[PDB]
Design a protein around this nucleic acid. Structure first.
Lengths: 230, 118
RNA sequence: AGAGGUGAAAUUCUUGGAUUUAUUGAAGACUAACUACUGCGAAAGCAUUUGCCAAGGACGUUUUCAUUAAUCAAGAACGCCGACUAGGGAUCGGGUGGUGUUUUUUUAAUGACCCACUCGGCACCUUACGAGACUGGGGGGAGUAUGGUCGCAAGGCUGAAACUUAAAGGAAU
């Protein structure tokens, strides 16, 4: 039949940029389109649900976070800025495919923990059984009771690292990979365990908004702006 | 100085998709597939078709104001081939050749993780 | 403004927006890589976590009973050989000893690896020595001939025969 004639949809598009929370280094991550702020769907509520997936290397300046992408959820719009909060964390698939080798065991755990806020998080963990230096047998398997005990102490100490953190404290805790060092130190009594990682953090429920808490995560701001000159 | 979109190249067999969206993925800038550039209905996956689709993708991205793209290259995945078709590398090469800067190439095909075969 | 799909196509979906992208929900399965000539189970079989319920095996034992035993027709549950010698490397479970490194400390006990020995397994690579005596069936392999028996098969332009017969077609041209 008859279809449609085009009218260019980039004349009604508005550019915002995304300010990341201050639990990171350099916080301008990029820009985002949205339709122009008309009545009946204003743009500031056409936003506020969008998550962006950025790289932690791009958020932290280094390159040892070249894996480990994270998600930032848009919460509050002010003055052509999208202030975001932490929404999750995930490895790239190539990292854990680069970690998995045969002739070892992968012990993976996960716990659903509610923080010192009322965010509830499903937080994961992977760990691979190392072989010691001077080990001549090619296997280095765990005896599955060592797996249950390792997974037990993984669950206990990382649910101790949450509940004893807020979201900002947990994010600043898992940027420099130090919960992995806690797992390694707490587990070398059982098995050697190379390259423990957290690998995945999911938000499940989020409490309320608390604009004051978000603006204290970012920085202040209030405007009296221009005035019309007639 | 760069403005970054993402590339979202989905290169199956029988077709390729070069679909730049914004950094979130909610707003699209010039989805043009392979079978809409030149269609003999079997050359949709061809490197020529992927080069044409990525070239007018990069035309509209330079029109809107995007200078660089983060490349997310996926295959059909699922309970199926998991290997990108002949159009993925061609679409990536044409996106780089046509002015856009490339960053962060990553492979986001859906590994099915215990699938639904039998 | 096409998407599937194919060697190409097509049925199919699609401007009442398909395919692609993002957020979220629901459903039914399934347990990827780790995954092995590894493990467990009487066999068929068994791979996410945690807990409960009973079970089982090997080992350890200066515990206990005291021949309680082995094989299978019937019946029940589930569904190059043997009576035979030594070894060798690797691996799984247990145990003993050694005495180094990872571990570590006055919270409980508890590892991992290396080495030797030993018991029991799944296999593998070899050795030495022994009579080891869902039922129904014609008779080797490769061919060859056929004055036998049972079949199937040729002719010859169709129309078109009682009719030297139309139209049209075929063939060669």
């Amino acid at each position: 039949g008859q279809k449609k004639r085009v009218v260019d949809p980039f004349t009604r598009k508005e550019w915002f940029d995304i300010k990341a929370p201050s639990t990171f280094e350099n916080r301008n991550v990029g820009k985002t389109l949205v339709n122009k702020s008309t009545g009946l769907k204003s743009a500031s509520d056409a936003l506020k649900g969008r998550v962006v997936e950025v790289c932690l290397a791009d958020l932290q300046g280094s390159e040892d976070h070249s894996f480990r992408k994270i998600k930032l959820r848009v919460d509050e719009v002010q003055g052509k800025n999208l202030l975001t909060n932490f929404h999750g964390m995930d490895f790239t698939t190539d990292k854990l495919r680069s970690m998995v080798r045969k002739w070892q065991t992968l012990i993976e755990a996960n716990v659903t923990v509610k923080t010192s806020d009322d965010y509830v998080l499903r937080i994961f963990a992977i760990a691979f059984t190392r072989k010691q230096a001077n080990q001549v047998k090619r296997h280095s398997y765990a005896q599955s009771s060592h797996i249950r005990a390792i997974r037990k102490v993984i669950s206990e100490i990382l649910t101790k690292e949450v509940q004893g953190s807020t979201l900002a404290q947990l994010t600043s805790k898992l940027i420099p990979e130090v919960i992995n060092k806690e797992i390694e130190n707490a587990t070398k009594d059982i098995f050697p365990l190379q390259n423990i990682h957290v690998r995945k953090v999911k938000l499940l429920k989020q409490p309320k908004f608390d604009v004051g808490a978000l603006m204290a995560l970012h920085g202040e701001g209030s405007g009296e702006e221009k005035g019309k000159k007639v | 100085s760069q403005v970054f979109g993402v590339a979202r190249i989905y290169a199956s067999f029988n077709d390729t998709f070069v679909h730049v969206t914004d950094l979130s993925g909610k707003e699209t800038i010039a989805r043009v597939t392979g079978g809409m550039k030149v269609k003999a209905d079997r050359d949709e996956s061809s490197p020529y078709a992927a080069m044409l689709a990525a070239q007018d993708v990069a035309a509209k991205c330079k029109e809107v104001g995007i200078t660089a793209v983060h490349v997310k290259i996926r295959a059909t995945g699922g309970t199926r081939t998991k290997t990108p078709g002949p159009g993925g590398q061609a679409a990536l090469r044409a996106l780089a050749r046509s002015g856009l800067r490339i960053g962060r190439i990553e492979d986001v095909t859906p590994v099915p993780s215990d699938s639904t075969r039998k």
